[PDB]
Enzyme design. Sequence first.
Site, mmCIF file in Angstrom:
data_model
loop_
_atom_site.group_PDB
_atom_site.id
_atom_site.type_symbol
_atom_site.label_atom_id
_atom_site.label_comp_id
_atom_site.label_asym_id
_atom_site.label_seq_id
_atom_site.Cartn_x
_atom_site.Cartn_y
_atom_site.Cartn_z
ATOM 1 N N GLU A 38 -9.135 -5.722 -3.666
ATOM 2 C CA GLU A 38 -8.522 -4.532 -3.080
ATOM 3 C C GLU A 38 -9.542 -3.631 -2.392
ATOM 4 O O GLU A 38 -9.359 -3.231 -1.246
ATOM 5 C CB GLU A 38 -7.755 -3.736 -4.136
ATOM 6 C CG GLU A 38 -6.559 -4.465 -4.765
ATOM 7 C CD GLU A 38 -5.337 -4.509 -3.858
ATOM 8 O OE1 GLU A 38 -5.282 -3.744 -2.868
ATOM 9 O OE2 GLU A 38 -4.424 -5.310 -4.146
ATOM 10 N N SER B 264 0.844 -1.202 0.000
ATOM 11 C CA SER B 264 0.000 0.000 0.000
ATOM 12 C C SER B 264 0.886 1.263 0.000
ATOM 13 O O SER B 264 1.691 1.451 -0.930
ATOM 14 C CB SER B 264 -0.949 -0.049 1.201
ATOM 15 O OG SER B 264 -1.782 1.097 1.322
ATOM 16 N N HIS C 78 -7.606 -5.993 0.883
ATOM 17 C CA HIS C 78 -6.366 -5.258 0.920
ATOM 18 C C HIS C 78 -5.646 -5.496 2.255
ATOM 19 O O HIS C 78 -6.221 -5.289 3.324
ATOM 20 C CB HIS C 78 -6.706 -3.782 0.742
ATOM 21 C CG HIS C 78 -5.524 -2.880 0.768
ATOM 22 N ND1 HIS C 78 -4.855 -2.502 -0.375
ATOM 23 C CD2 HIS C 78 -4.890 -2.276 1.797
ATOM 24 C CE1 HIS C 78 -3.854 -1.704 -0.051
ATOM 25 N NE2 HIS C 78 -3.853 -1.550 1.262
#
EC number: 3.1.1.7
Lengths: 532, 535
Positions: A324, A200, A437
């Site tokens: 995600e 990320s 995610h």
Amino acid sequence: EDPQLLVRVRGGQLRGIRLKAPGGPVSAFLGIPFAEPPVGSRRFMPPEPKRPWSGVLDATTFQNVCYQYVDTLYPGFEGTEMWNPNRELSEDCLYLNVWTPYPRPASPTPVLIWIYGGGFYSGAASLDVYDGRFLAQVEGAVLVSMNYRVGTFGFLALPGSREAPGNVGLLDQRLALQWVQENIAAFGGDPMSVTLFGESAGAASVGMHILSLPSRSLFHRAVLQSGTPNGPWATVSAGEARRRATLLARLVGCNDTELIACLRTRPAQDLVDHEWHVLPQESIFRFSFVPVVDGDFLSDTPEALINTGDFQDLQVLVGVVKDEGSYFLVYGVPGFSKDNESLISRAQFLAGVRIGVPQASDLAAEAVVLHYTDWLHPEDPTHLRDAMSAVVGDHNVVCPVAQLAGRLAAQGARVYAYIFEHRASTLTWPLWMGVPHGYEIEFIFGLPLDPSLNYTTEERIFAQRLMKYWTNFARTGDPNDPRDSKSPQWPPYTTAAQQYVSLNLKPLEVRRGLRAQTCAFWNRFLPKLLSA
Amino acid sequence: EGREDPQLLVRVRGGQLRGIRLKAPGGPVSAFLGIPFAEPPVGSRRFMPPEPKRPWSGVLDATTFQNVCYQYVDTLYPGFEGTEMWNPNRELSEDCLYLNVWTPYPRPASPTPVLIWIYGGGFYSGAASLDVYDGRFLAQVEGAVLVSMNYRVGTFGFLALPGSREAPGNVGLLDQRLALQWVQENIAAFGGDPMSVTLFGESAGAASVGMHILSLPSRSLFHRAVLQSGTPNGPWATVSAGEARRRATLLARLVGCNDTELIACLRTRPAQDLVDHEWHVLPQESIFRFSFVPVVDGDFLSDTPEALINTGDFQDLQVLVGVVKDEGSYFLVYGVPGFSKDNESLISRAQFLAGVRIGVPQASDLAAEAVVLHYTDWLHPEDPTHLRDAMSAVVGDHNVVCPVAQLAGRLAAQGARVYAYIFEHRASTLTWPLWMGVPHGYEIEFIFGLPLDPSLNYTTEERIFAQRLMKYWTNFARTGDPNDPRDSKSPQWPPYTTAAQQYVSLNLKPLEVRRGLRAQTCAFWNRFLPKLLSA
Ligand SMILES: *[C@@H]1O[C@H](CO)[C@@H](O)[C@H](O)[C@H]1NC(C)=O
């Protein structure tokens, strides 16, 4: 006095702790100061090398977490708490950690460096999912991770000023990498085989080190898990950051010098109180304070830098997870909660797009809805939920990744890509979130190898395989097993073929085009649509 | 009379006709060909609505097809069956308002349901006399009464100075409507049921059928309707009054010419002049550049078809509609550079972007770009084969498939029994290149039962397929349901619903039901693209 647990770094002597891992012992060296505490008059400023220390500095425990907002959406909930600061919060937090094999490597070992995520407003190296003991033990790796300043403390900028030039969080990261060049040998690491990996905002960070020349001689390879330096959320324009800084100043009661001197007087927690009031825009991926395009660290916008850069001698691993956008839906998009199945109405779906793509004009949002609607079942709440998840995932991660992987291959970098598809058996989020995610990290880091964690025996094998991909990539620039023959090979991503792999429990599978059509929509169409 | 076959002598409101006993594969049929249904629209009558044919005396020889309406003859590929099959097969003349009738032999005792065919040809060409519209097979095998009429095309049919007296517009459709009137009055003399008249057409003929569904003075003259690869909505089937006026004027200029005085001039020009210049009104590089099509006149079309299909009530209406697998391919060779009947038509990406501007001539820079986005396979953005196929797809989808998709949509939504199909069989006999697939127009020969003529060289399987389709069509004419009320073993043809969007495949295999008529793509064309032309 174990002499394996004693190291002499430039600033003096360190005493590590011997930690045990499933299949043997590892040397840990937790909470090593890499910089002078960025406190008082140093708040907002570039980090300075730590001054030397007398005696034997204790490095047996994790140090404080950089000062940050703590998440309270789901109090007591494992799904969120696991990302929350697990040590005392402090502005004095510039410490790195080193895991090595016990006994320490006889010859110089490939070093992986982890940069954590949390959208530049949160995160900590001390979190459990970044426990470097497994990769140290099993794969015999030197694993390093550092804290860097998040939120205002690390990314609040008044561009062009002396006393808050911005990007200092990224500079913290750089100093950690500089420390590694100068010190890692003492631990058995090979300074000439450094691989950055991150997720990320950590991935975007990694990305920014690729894009910033001064960083480029501090590492050799890079892994970007589920994040990029391009895209909607990773950067801000000089102008816009200046604005955000100013409105935060005004928001707490405050010439650049004067405006900053005031801020420095303020308790840390006062700044955090208004971190989330600088984008009154109902965004998802707000976070007011992110790396700024400054003409310094970032010599131009990532898109621009990515477009023109030469990546001749560079290997890069990039990927995304299957879902995600699901995680982010519960954080402000109506009708989404961890507790029900979140089957949304069509009206809610149009509403969500305006949040998920806050940059989008009416026509643009119209397009997004038009593309993502299944016109065969346009009303079915399951498709609209799953769609909303996709709009967000794709716009913020998948497509930015596709775009990045594209340009790097075009410009001579060697690229490997994956989509991560296995949902953890221990996962505490609802089923409808799929593979959210963040949930590949536990596998890459090798957590299933700890039986005390109740991961299925199949998962414990999968983790081993991923660990072997990452360290293999780290060792050679090539994730593939260098002397194991016929497992199906992971082919490099090229713009021509566009091959990636599915990382899951079934053996590798080669697919082509990473959301080819849809990313086309986000990357080629939408830009043209908003402007003119 | 005296010696003549008594099955061939019939009286209609205009007087006596003598027909011809024609040989069909499985037995004889009765043909009354070249019956006048209107006063020849010549001289001061040009551009004017038809007047009913004044009764003649004695017996009219109705044994041969009459003149074809004055039209442009295609010469893209001389000698080529592929194009010649559509070319006029009788003399060209402004005196062309005649219709044809096929009935069983002998003509049946109880009244049989009537099928009326309106031919296509972009409103610029066509004849009821072409071999592919031979009613003999439908007449013989299915016991049906088939009628087809000639109707004016090109300037003669559709050049309009809207609001004027001397060139109202839509006269071609009025020719069609008069023919339907003629059927209402006279078809019983042939054993036809005027209580059961199904319209069917293809392409512009389809659009014409559509517009009869939309023009209330016409609704009381038929009961069911079939639209094969065509609609009254969509980009090529109609023109705004203003635009129609602009074109009429520009053509008047071209031939060298107060609405009255202008038309009066046009009327003095030989038919050939009008034809020779009807294409030069739009230099505008475009495929479906037909200059003279139905005008939205606030009379025949009370409003745009798009509006009417969205607001009208269609409770009492059963419709059959479909498309072929490759609507666009055909069109590419008529001026998309790169495309030819004589080679593989593999094109470059450059030629693709080029082709999209010609295919979608009304598209802004941005919209064109959007079309290219949606149609590019980004996995292989440069593949000649894919791009070629994409270009076919663009033209087909924009002009036929999505309009039809839309039409099927709005109608089912407003309470009609809609039946949808996609026709996927390539004629074994097709003379067009492999790459064109199953092109626009190439289902007609099956619906009409041509394969049954063993001299035509169709495979046995095709012969069987033709019969199957003829059943579907005539069943629909009879009952408003293409399904066989007897045999329920064979797979059902479900109505198309907005709920489930069910259509069937027509090919050598039994019916397969599919969901979604190009659902995603037609979303693009019908919902998104319009708004992309709003600013
Ligand atoms: C096929 O014929 C067309 C039209 O004459 C020509 O322009 C095209 O280049 C040909 N295609 C190829 C590449 O053989």
